[PDB]
């Protein structure tokens, strides 16, 4: 009867139990059908046509989402939803209509006893032990700057950037084309993504690192392919994530993440800006690059009042910040009053989900 925590990302579902220090289950967020009914997660990945029912953080395909959830309960976590309060997560600026659908599904389709939905970036902040700060949440499909004061996200200052993890993978495949390594297929992309996650880091000074790559090499590193073949990588290590500071790299016209962070803060009430500067929390897989902390520190220092207190919080577990946040929250005796119960739903219908809050 322990509550379930389910973080639906554009790329990865993260699921598990309240109490737990990390998501018990983590699988690709995809539904496949022959190009017997439908294959979910990894089943589909191994002949099939693939859909991501979540784009840039938003559920855009309800029937496939429904199928994702059934897999999550019954195949991954192996639980009967009726016996479990369930907390879901949502993207910043999710339309109120979604969360209502999302609720209705849980109650009428999964007959959960109770459920909750919380904002992704909020949970991440929570997992940093704070109620106030500005989150940079970057997953596979979207990046947000989300200022939060007292557990309230500040929607007028929220920044969304469609550039995230997948885009970085795809760009790495294109710059790997430079050394003339060929990657296209299912199998091939997976390798590139692993390379990204294992070898890429953020250059503290990109142009200095480039003028240096064009020189020495403690730079270049090797990597073994499945068949035994060994490959070598150079400036691609820091050029790939540099895209986050220079989106022009994939032909995106948008401003870089440091700039969007600043602009977000500046779209907040001036009184609280000090507190935002002092609490810049990162979460999501795309924030996992070594050195990112210090590069952001630098970029933010370059833009702020020169005497401003600047702190970057990058917890080592920030890969699962969101989820962990959920777990902690669903665990609290104080939170138990905040479940939406089946009975409440019945008498008030889906609109009830918006109510309560901390």
């Amino acid at each position: 009867t322990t509550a379930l925590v389910c973080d639906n990302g554009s790329g990865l579902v993260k699921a598990g139990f309240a109490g737990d220090d990390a998501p018990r289950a983590v699988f690709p967020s995809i539904v496949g059908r022959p190009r017997k009914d439908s294959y979910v997660g990894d089943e589909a990945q191994s002949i099939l046509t693939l859909k991501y029912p979540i784009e840039h953080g938003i559920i855009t395909n309800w029937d496939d989402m429904e199928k994702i959830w059934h897999h999550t309960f019954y195949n991954e976590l192996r639980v009967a939803p009726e016996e479990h309060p369930t907390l879901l997560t949502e993207a910043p600026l999710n339309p109120k209509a979604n969360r209502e659908k999302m609720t209705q599904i849980m109650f009428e389709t999964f007959n959960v006893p109770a459920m909750y939905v919380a904002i992704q970036a909020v949970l991440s902040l929570y997992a940093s032990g704070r109620t106030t700060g500005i989150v940079l949440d970057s997953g596979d499909g979207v990046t947000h700057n989300v200022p939060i004061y007292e557990g309230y996200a500040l929607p007028h200052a929220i920044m969304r950037l469609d550039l995230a993890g997948r885009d970085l993978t795809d760009y790495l495949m294109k710059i790997l084309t430079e050394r003339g390594y060929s990657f296209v297929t299912t199998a091939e992309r997976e390798i590139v993504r692993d390379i990204k996650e294992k070898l890429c880091y953020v250059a503290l000074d990109f142009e200095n690192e480039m003028a240096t790559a064009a020189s020495s090499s403690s730079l270049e590193k090797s990597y073994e392919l499945p068949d035994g073949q060994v490959i070598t990588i150079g400036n691609e290590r820091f050029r790939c994530p540099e895209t986050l500071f220079q989106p022009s790299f994939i032909g995106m016209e948008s401003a870089g993440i440091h700039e969007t962070t600043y602009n977000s803060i500046m779209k907040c009430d001036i009184d609280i800006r000090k507190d935002l500067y002092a609490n810049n929390v990162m979460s999501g897989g795309t924030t996992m690059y070594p050195g990112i902390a210090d590069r952001m520190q630098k970029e933010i220092t370059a833009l702020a009042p020169s005497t401003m207190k600047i702190k970057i919080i990058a917890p080592p577990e920030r890969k699962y910040s969101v989820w962990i946040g959920g777990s902690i929250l669903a665990s609290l005796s104080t939170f138990q009053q905040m479940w939406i119960t089946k009975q409440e739903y019945d008498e008030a219908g889906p609109s009830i989900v918006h109510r309560k809050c901390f």
């Binding site: 309240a18 109490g19 032990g129 704070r130 109620t131 007292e150 962990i324 902690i328 609290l332």
Partner: protein, 117 residues
């Protein structure tokens, strides 16, 4: 080693149950995540700090409570009050005692030009 076994066995039945122990603030709550008792705590703390920072600016004035009859009106000092109120009620009930005792009959009024025959 036969002996290490006995002390143990007498010490494992000397034990309180974890329920009791978190009940005494020795244990953190089983079921909260065990890494992240720190942040969990931090967070509960902030949560409270915030409630405080608010409920404080919303702090009423002594005046106002007394307007609502929360506090007694109005001097003297914390400790005196308690009794002082006993005295308020005492002094008054007595002040009322004779007042009713020596209450004019209806005739007094009627003749005093108030009320009908």
């Amino acid at each position: 080693l036969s002996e290490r076994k006995n002390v143990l066995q007498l010490k494992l039945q000397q034990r309180r149950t974890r329920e009791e122990l978190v009940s005494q603030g020795i244990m953190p709550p089983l079921k909260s995540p065990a890494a992240f008792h720190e942040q969990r705590r931090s967070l509960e703390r902030a949560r409270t700090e915030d409630y405080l920072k608010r409920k404080i600016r919303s702090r009423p004035e002594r005046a106002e409570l007394v307007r609502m009859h929360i506090l007694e009106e109005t001097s003297a000092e914390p400790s005196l009050q308690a009794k002082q109120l006993k005295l308020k009620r005492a002094r008054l009930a007595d002040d009322l005692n004779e007042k009713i005792a020596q209450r004019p009959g209806p005739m007094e009024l009627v003749e005093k030009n108030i009320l009908p025959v």
